[PDB]
Copies of this chain bind each other. A is one copy, B any other.
Amino acid sequence: RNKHQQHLAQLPKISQSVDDVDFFYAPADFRETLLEKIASAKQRICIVALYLEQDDGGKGILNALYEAKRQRPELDVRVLVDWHRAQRNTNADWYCRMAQENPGVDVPVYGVPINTREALGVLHFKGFIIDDSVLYSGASLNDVYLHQHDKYRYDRYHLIRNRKMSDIMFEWVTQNIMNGRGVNRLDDVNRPKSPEIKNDIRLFRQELRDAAYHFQGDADNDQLSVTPLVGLGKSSLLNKTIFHLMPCAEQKLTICTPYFNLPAILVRNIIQLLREGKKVEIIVGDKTANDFYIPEDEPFKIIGALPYLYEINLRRFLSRLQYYVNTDQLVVRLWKDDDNTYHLKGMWVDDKWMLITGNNLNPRAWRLDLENAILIHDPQLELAPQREKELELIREHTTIVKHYRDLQSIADYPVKVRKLIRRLRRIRIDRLISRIL
């Protein structure tokens, strides 16, 4: 076997029943499922998210957590969010109010700082661990992710009932994050300020640099399996698995990413597949489906240039590989649904592998942020109905790009955008930006 298949063959794998894997296809279903599982939880609830917002959607979830803990005080309830993101009237201030307005009921909210400054590391670990299940989505908890109030942010939603995996993930969070240096409660009114814990965070980050899941594989490569993965930095096991996964496509590789900004190494893999005669599908958002996109009527801001920069990346990529577009090998899809926003991540390898992850597949995720995933191996095609239904619906709001010219060029962009981008490319800062966002 080639070294790539060998890497995958020798991954530890946890066995998994087909009956214990449930897909959900819409953010509203995901909201309701989360609430349902919170109500019916008996032992533990561990909520890890980038953030939990002080809005109707987020309130819904936090109230459901307090309510479940009131009805079962023995229930082990924990919420972990990003330290920096929660503090920019902030979410952390709101977490404090909630704790005061609900005395007796113990629902701790911890802030995880992955680096001393947000721009240099965020908590992209994903997982709602509820008893023996993991409800895994890229979604944070707010109005749009949960499709409160008529506007939504499209993510993916998988519930996986699996004692062993949930234990591994729950236990990993306990030891490495919750009991880690420089984790600090956000529901404490006296929580430190970032500078005061700066050294704690540095030591913490180093501890995280080689924290990995340790568990023995119980499943061979002829049966349905799941493999949890976690990583921080270039040489994580996750990153290695993502790298080796792509070349194992005997037929076709599919990728979702919100922000098209692939590291060079993943691009090289894509090009190798195309050269070997295989197929590659890439599903990204239209610039208007990006959450930083500012309608052209509203006042333009500096940050509203990001969707344009991601489009420039897509157009440059397509430009170089137009030959493969023409042979129907390379397929690029733009997702767009009025002013809703796109946040799909993942990787499909043929009909056999499905990576579900929080990983945006960009240089940031590759070096700076704490990332994780689950790798589903389905060698018997037992999830085929759901896999196909999920891809069906993902594609439904997509246009296929048949020519790089179908994407707008810098010349077509609004004037303030155009001037900004020309200024940036003059001094070569465009290259730096693509490595930090």
Q: Which of B36, B43, B218 is the one whose CB lies under 8 Å from A167?
A: B218
Q: How would residues 70 to 105 of chain A score, 1 for a CB under 8 Å from any chain B CB and 0 otherwise?
A: 111110100000000000000000000000000000
Closest Cβ neighbor of A175 among chain B residues? B71
> Does A72 lie within 8 Å of B199, measured CB to CB?
no
Q: Which of A3-11, A272-280, A420-428 contacts B (4 or more CB under 8 A)?
A: A3-11
Contacting B at CB under 8 A, from A46-86, are 70-74, 76
Q: Which of B7, B39, B70 is the one whose CB lies under 8 Å from A190?
A: B7
| A200 contacts B by Cβ under 8 Å | yes
Taking the closest CB of chain B, its distance from the CB of A14, in whole angstroms, is: 10
Once bound together, how far apart are the Cα atoms of A379 and B201, in whole Å? Answer: 36
Q: Which of B43, B203, B235 is the one whose CB lies under 8 Å from A196?
A: B235
Q: Which residues of the partner chain B approach A217 to less than 8 Å between Cβ atoms?
A: 163
> Does B10 lie within 8 Å of A190, measured CB to CB?
yes
> Does B218 lie within 8 Å of A175, measured CB to CB?
no
| A132 contacts B by Cβ under 8 Å | yes
Q: Which residues of the partner chain B approach A7 to less than 8 Å between Cβ atoms?
A: 190
Q: How would residues 1 to 45 of chain A score, 1 for a CB under 8 Å from any chain B CB and 0 otherwise?
A: 001001100100001010000000000000000001001000100
> Does B199 lie within 8 Å of A209, measured CB to CB?
yes
Taking the closest CB of chain B, its distance from the CB of A144, in whole angstroms, is: 24
| A195 contacts B by Cβ under 8 Å | yes
Once bound together, how far apart are the Cα atoms of A73 and B174, in whole Å? Answer: 11
| A321 contacts B by Cβ under 8 Å | no
| A198 contacts B by Cβ under 8 Å | yes
> Does B36 lie within 8 Å of A164, measured CB to CB?
no
> Does B189 lie within 8 Å of A17, measured CB to CB?
no
> Does B175 lie within 8 Å of A70, measured CB to CB?
yes
> Does B196 lie within 8 Å of A240, measured CB to CB?
yes
Q: Which residues of the partner chain B approach A72 to less than 8 Å between Cβ atoms?
A: 175, 179
Q: Which residues of the partner chain B approach A233 to less than 8 Å between Cβ atoms?
A: 199
> Does A190 lie within 8 Å of B15, measured CB to CB?
no
Q: Which residues of the partner chain B approach A164 to less than 8 Å between Cβ atoms?
A: 15, 167, 218
Taking the closest CB of chain B, its distance from the CB of A181, in whole angstroms, is: 9
> Does A235 lie within 8 Å of B198, measured CB to CB?
yes
| A419 contacts B by Cβ under 8 Å | no
Taking the closest CB of chain B, its distance from the CB of A322, in whole angstroms, is: 33
Q: Which of B15, B39, B189, B203 is the one whose CB lies under 8 Å from A218?
A: B15
Once bound together, how far apart are the Cα atoms of A399 and B181, in whole Å? Answer: 50
Once bound together, how far apart are the Cα atoms of A216 and B43, in whole Å? Answer: 10
| A339 contacts B by Cβ under 8 Å | no
> Does A235 lie within 8 Å of B3, measured CB to CB?
no
Taking the closest CB of chain B, its distance from the CB of A311, in whole angstroms, is: 32
> Does B71 lie within 8 Å of A199, measured CB to CB?
no
Once bound together, how far apart are the Cα atoms of A346 and B199, in whole Å? Answer: 28
> Does B216 lie within 8 Å of A210, measured CB to CB?
no
> Does A6 lie within 8 Å of B190, measured CB to CB?
yes
> Does A163 lie within 8 Å of B216, measured CB to CB?
yes
Once bound together, how far apart are the Cα atoms of A190 and B132, in whole Å? Answer: 21
| A234 contacts B by Cβ under 8 Å | yes
Contacting B at CB under 8 A, from A167-226, are 167, 171, 174-175, 179, 189-190, 195-200, 203, 209-210, 216-218, 223
> Does B190 lie within 8 Å of A235, measured CB to CB?
no
Q: How would residues 218 to 251 of chain A score, 1 for a CB under 8 Å from any chain B CB and 0 otherwise?
A: 1000010000000001110000100000000000
Closest Cβ neighbor of A164 among chain B residues? B218
- 30 CB < 8 A contacts A-B: A3-B189, A3-B190, A6-B189, A10-B190, A15-B164, A15-B218, A36-B74, A39-B76, A70-B175, A71-B175, A71-B179, A72-B175, A72-B179, A73-B175, A131-B216, A132-B216, A163-B217, A163-B218, A164-B167, A167-B216, A167-B218, A195-B235, A196-B235, A198-B235, A199-B209, A199-B233, A199-B235, A200-B210, A203-B210, A218-B223
Residues of chain A whose beta carbon lies under 8 Å from any beta carbon of chain B: 3, 6-7, 10, 15, 17, 36, 39, 43, 70-74, 76, 131-132, 163-164, 167, 171, 174-175, 179, 189-190, 195-200, 203, 209-210, 216-218, 223, 233-235, 240
